[PDB]
Amino acid sequence: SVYDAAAQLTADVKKDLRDSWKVIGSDKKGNGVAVMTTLFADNQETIGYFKRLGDVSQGMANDKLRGHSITLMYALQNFIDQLDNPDDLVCVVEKFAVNHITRKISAAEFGKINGPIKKVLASKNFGDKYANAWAKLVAVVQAAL
Amino acid sequence: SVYDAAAQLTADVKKDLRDSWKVIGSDKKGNGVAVMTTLFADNQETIGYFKRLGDVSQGMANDKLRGHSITLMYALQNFIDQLDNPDDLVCVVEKFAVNHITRKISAAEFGKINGPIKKVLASKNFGDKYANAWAKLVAVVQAAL
Numbered sequence: 401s402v403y404d405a406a407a408q409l410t411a412d413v414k415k416d417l418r419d420s421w422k423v424i425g426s427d428k429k430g431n432g433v434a435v436m437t438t439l440f441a442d443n444q445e446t447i448g449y450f451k452r453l454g455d456v457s458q459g460m461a462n463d464k465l466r467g468h469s470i471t472l473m474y475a476l477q478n479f480i481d482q483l484d485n486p487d488d489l490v491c492v493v494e495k496f497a498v499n500h501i502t503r504k505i506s507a508a509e510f511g512k513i514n515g516p517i518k519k520v521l522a523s524k525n526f527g528d529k530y531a532n533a534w535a536k537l538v539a540v541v542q543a544a545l
Numbered sequence: 546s547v548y549d550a551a552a553q554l555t556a557d558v559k560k561d562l563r564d565s566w567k568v569i570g571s572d573k574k575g576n577g578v579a580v581m582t583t584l585f586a587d588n589q590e591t592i593g594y595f596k597r598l599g600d601v602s603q604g605m606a607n608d609k610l611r612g613h614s615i616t617l618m619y620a621l622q623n624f625i626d627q628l629d630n631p632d633d634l635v636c637v638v639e640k641f642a643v644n645h646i647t648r649k650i651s652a653a654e655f656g657k658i659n660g661p662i663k664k665v666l667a668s669k670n671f672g673d674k675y676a677n678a679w680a681k682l683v684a685v686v687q688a689a690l
């Protein structure tokens with residue numbers, strides 16, 4: 401249930417998400433591409449899903465990858481801005497869920513993003529505490545897949 | 546090209562875009578739904594394209610329409626944030642262009658959004674000057690369609 405998952409976002413979790421987002425969200429282009437490139441390096445078996453982006457090994461130099469990456473960060477910004485209202489968070493999460501259900505992405509594969517996020521957070525000095533907080537948010541999307 | 550269209554947005558245009566967005570973008574749920582509902586009211590022929598959203602006449606009550614509307618406002622937020630870097634604005638614009646090209650939305654049809662935006666701006670007292678500024682931004686997307 402996406403509703404039960406959304407309920408797991410307690411006061412403490414929401415604070416950690418906001419505090420860390422102030423930092424990671426300050427450079428959407430750079431951190432977005434870093435998240436994506438890490439995903440492709442750590443789980444090479446997912447590259448096949450992104451054929452539309454072309455050669456993702458080019459990183460920041462790939463225009464399609466950069467556009468996709470920046471937009472991905474705005475999806476996260478969207479989630480963070482809906483933390484105050486469970487009903488609105490749910491409706492936006494289900495919106496992006498569809499975008500992935502159409503690409504045949506399961507909850508298990510969607511979860512492969514936790515690794516990259518934890519690595520990007522660690523590079524900015526945010527440890528496991530924040531990684532776990534973000535994992536709970538990703539869990540809300542997984543519940544809708 | 547899309548670059549020429551984007552590279553043409555002047556300082557005065559960007560200023561009016563940012564000033565009006567500070568207001569219109571402050572309530573993404575309320576103004577986003579207002580935009581979508583206005584589009585359906587004035588251009589009833591577009592209703593069929595949004596069958597995935599269900600009964601759009603339900604407005605705010607429709608969770609799918611609400612999720613779509615809030616998300617659309619973040620697409621505009623994305624554009625606004627990339628105004629000072631034409632290279633970044635272009636790659637995000639082309640990304641959203643693909644989303645509509647896949648739905649067979651022509652440049653002319655995409656332009657139907659100008660009416661709704663003009664009316665929403667007007668509801669907050671932003672006149673023709675501001676409406677013209679937004680049509681210039683919508684034109685950057687049309688250059689990609």
Ligand code: HEM
Pocket residue numbers: 446449450452453468471472475476496499500503505509510511512513538644
């Ligand atoms: C925090 C986690 C993630 C977020 C918020 C997210 C967000 C997005 C967004 C906003 C889009 C564009 C939707 C569209 O225009 O159709 C997208 C596309 C996509 N996502 Fe994700 N995504 C996430 C994780 C993943 C993961 C882990 C995978 C694969 C294992 C995945 C696979 C895809 C694919 C295949 C596309 C289509 C790319 C294209 O052809 O343009 N996503 N995602």
Ligand code: HEM
Pocket residue numbers: 499591594595596597598613616617620621641644645648650654655656657658683
């Ligand atoms: C200010 C201009 C507009 C913006 C910023 C915008 C933005 C968006 C975004 C973010 C999506 C979701 C893409 C996805 O996840 O697949 C979307 C979907 C869509 N848009 Fe637009 N759009 C605009 C104008 C229009 C207009 C005027 C039309 C109709 C003539 C149109 C037709 C569609 C359709 C049919 C969908 C698919 C909806 C669905 O089934 O989920 N858009 N738009």
